[PDB]
A paper describes a structure:
Biliverdin IXβ reductase (BLVRB) has emerged as a promising therapeutic target for thrombocytopenia due to its involvement in reactive oxygen species (ROS) mechanisms. In the pathway of heme degradation, BLVRB utilizes NAD(P)H downstream of heme oxygenase(s)-1 (inducible HMOX1) and -2 (constitutive HMOX2) to reduce biliverdin (BV)-IXβ to bilirubin (BR)-IXβ. Consequently, the BV/BR redox cycle, under the control of BLVRB, plays a crucial role in regulating reactive oxygen species (ROS). A large-scale transcriptomic analysis on essential and reactive thrombocytosis cohorts identified biliverdin IXβ reductase (BLVRB) as a regulator of platelet production through MK differentiation by controlling reactive oxygen species (ROS).
Author numbering:
A (entry chain A), B (entry chain B): 1 to 206
Amino acid sequence: MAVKKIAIFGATGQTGLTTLAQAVQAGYEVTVLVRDSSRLPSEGPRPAHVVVGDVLQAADVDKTVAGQDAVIVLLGTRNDLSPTTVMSEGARNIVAAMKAHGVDKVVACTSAFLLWDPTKVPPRLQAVTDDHIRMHKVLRESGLKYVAVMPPHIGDQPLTGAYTVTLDGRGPSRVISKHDLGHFMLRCLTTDEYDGHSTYPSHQYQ
Amino acid sequence: MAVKKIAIFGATGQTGLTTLAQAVQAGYEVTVLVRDSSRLPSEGPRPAHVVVGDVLQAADVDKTVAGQDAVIVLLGTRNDLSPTTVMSEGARNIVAAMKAHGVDKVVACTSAFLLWDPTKVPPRLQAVTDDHIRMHKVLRESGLKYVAVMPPHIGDQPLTGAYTVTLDGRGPSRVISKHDLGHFMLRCLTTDEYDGHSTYPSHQYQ
Ligand SMILES: NC(=O)c1ccc[n+]([C@@H]2O[C@H](COP(=O)([O-])OP(=O)(O)OC[C@H]3O[C@@H](n4cnc5c(N)ncnc54)[C@H](OP(=O)(O)O)[C@@H]3O)[C@@H](O)[C@H]2O)c1
Ligand SMILES: NC(=O)c1ccc[n+]([C@@H]2O[C@H](COP(=O)([O-])OP(=O)(O)OC[C@H]3O[C@@H](n4cnc5c(N)ncnc54)[C@H](OP(=O)(O)O)[C@@H]3O)[C@@H](O)[C@H]2O)c1
Ligand SMILES: O=C(O)c1cc(/C=C/c2ccc(O)c(C(=O)O)c2)ccc1O
Ligand SMILES: O=C(O)c1cc(/C=C/c2ccc(O)c(C(=O)O)c2)ccc1O
């Protein structure tokens, strides 16, 4: 494995949990950053390394990024649609840590709304989308090998590995399962073909 | 009317650098106040006059404002997430220097959060937004000819010169390219129509 040690940010979240499970099964040595109050469930798969802290603390992000081959970012605000900078400021700390530690590959999830006409983004999601836009700018400007993953609705359908990946535009379906989205984040570790592109994974579950 | 000499504050910032370059290419005689001259580009368009100093030092500001026809303010304190008064104290120094040297025109950048409901502000941006509000009041109460430029997200898109400007309200998208924002800063030097108004520049970048 050319990529074997990875940091996952957001591993306790909807997509992070299945991404972690798939990564451990695939043989990755995974380091996670978890907030003190929200640890990984005791029954689930165990990462190799756990850092307890906050993506808003440069020190905690540095500890998580040190020694890795690549970074997966699945940060979010769960059900909370309020104005926030946690994703963009978290990305700022991640970029600084990758540069300091010689890590180049970052696969980071924002949203397909970054490929929408802004006048059609639902107003209830505008505040979160605003921080996705801020995040994407931070990562694009970093000069790192950045894969911008921009999914549409994240659903509960199965892992298929059969989804479409649309480059630099909206794809033909409006859903991706959380399991397939995690599968795609990990696929991006094994190829350079999506570096510098936006990617829209989607599938028809049938 | 004929503005030929301008001071730019914040010329080494994201918007400042392109405003400066555009001003020099268009023929303005530009004076900049910079804390570190190595943060100015060594190649291409270069300002006519460089004052090395700090906007918090009244004598440095006075030396920058002396002899100008108008002032552009693109100050910012990106890293401050808790109460901060750099921009508003800078604006007090600028206003005092403008009055002492007979400079009547100031075009200054705050943010579109000043046009929207306060709960739109992400918590980590509350402090900078409070100081934007303080700087806006300093400039409004000065009696100077003041164009308040209140942009949304500042993006990276190429200069278009085709953006929308809405007066005393919001408008189309929630993004303006730094290049288009700089272009609009300079357009405000050539007209009185925005004096005493708030302006919201935005555009759709396809
Ligand atoms: N739901 C959709 O249909 C959809 C569609 C497109 C895009 N998106 C975006 O896709 C991304 C992933 O969504 P998701 O549903 O998988 O994520 P999620 O369930 O909202 O999980 C968010 C993850 O980020 C962690 N996190 C939040 N703040 C943190 C902080 N300060 N420090 C460290 N970790 C922090 C959370 O940890 P905790 O356990 O401590 O909370 C959690 O692990 C999000 O950005 C979302 O906006 C979602
Ligand atoms: N999407 C956005 O980022 C956004 C959106 C809406 C509004 N705004 C606001 O737009 C304005 C311009 O934003 P920007 O991103 O273009 O600015 P920026 O890149 O953060 O640049 C800030 C400028 O102000 C200078 N500065 C800071 N403190 C100074 C001091 N004590 N003395 C002299 N100069 C000082 C900086 O000089 P140094 O190079 O020496 O640091 C730099 O030139 C800001 O006020 C910002 O809050 C930004
Ligand atoms: O909390 C949430 O629910 C949430 C939802 C989103 C939805 C993103 C999206 C983009 C493009 C799409 O086409 C569709 C669709 O079609 O369903 C959905 C983004 C961020 C979120 O935090
Ligand atoms: O530190 C920073 O980077 C910073 C960023 C800002 C951004 C303010 C703003 C206003 C209206 C907006 O719509 C949006 C958007 O859409 O992203 C953003 C302000 C002050 C800052 O110091």
